[PDB]
Design a protein around this ligand. Sequence first.
Ligand SMILES: CCOc1ccccc1O
Ligand SMILES: CCOc1ccccc1O
Length: 162
Amino acid sequence: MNIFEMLRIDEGLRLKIYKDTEGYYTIGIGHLLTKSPSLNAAKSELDKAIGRNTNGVITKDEAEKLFNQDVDAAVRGILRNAKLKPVYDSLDAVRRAAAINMVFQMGETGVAGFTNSLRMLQQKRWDEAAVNLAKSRWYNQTPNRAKRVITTFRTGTWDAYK
Ligand SMILES: CCOc1ccccc1O
Ligand SMILES: CCOc1ccccc1O
């Protein structure tokens, strides 16, 4: 298991435009196109991302290319964030993957709400962190995914991903 396999499980793979759990146009492996309710606006973003007129469909290779970019961007974003970087650097590699997963799903804006969890994670108070993480809109709206990510933070193992 690694961050690519983990996110592939959590995000799935779809080669045509679809709406994610929040109702936003998405393609591939969790590649958010736009929060606009306009399908045309999403098709434009897709074409811009792929570099051709796609008509709302992409190949597996293209999906994977966007995915690699998205993962890279998530990590690079963490490292450029003065609040996230020190916590990220304090973690082992397994727990780092849990961190990347969260940023991938909700963005740096989304994880901004997690100040108290971040502190407990930097303190390595894993069970406390786990309890605090579940007290969230995130957990309530995507409980099964959140439980997997939380177990990963709690244990520093890949047990939740078999
Ligand atoms: C991972 C998303 O997969 C789908 C979404 C909407 C319709 C069919 C899908 O397989
Ligand atoms: C609760 C979110 O956890 C993290 C996110 C980004 C970097 C390090 C983290 O512990």
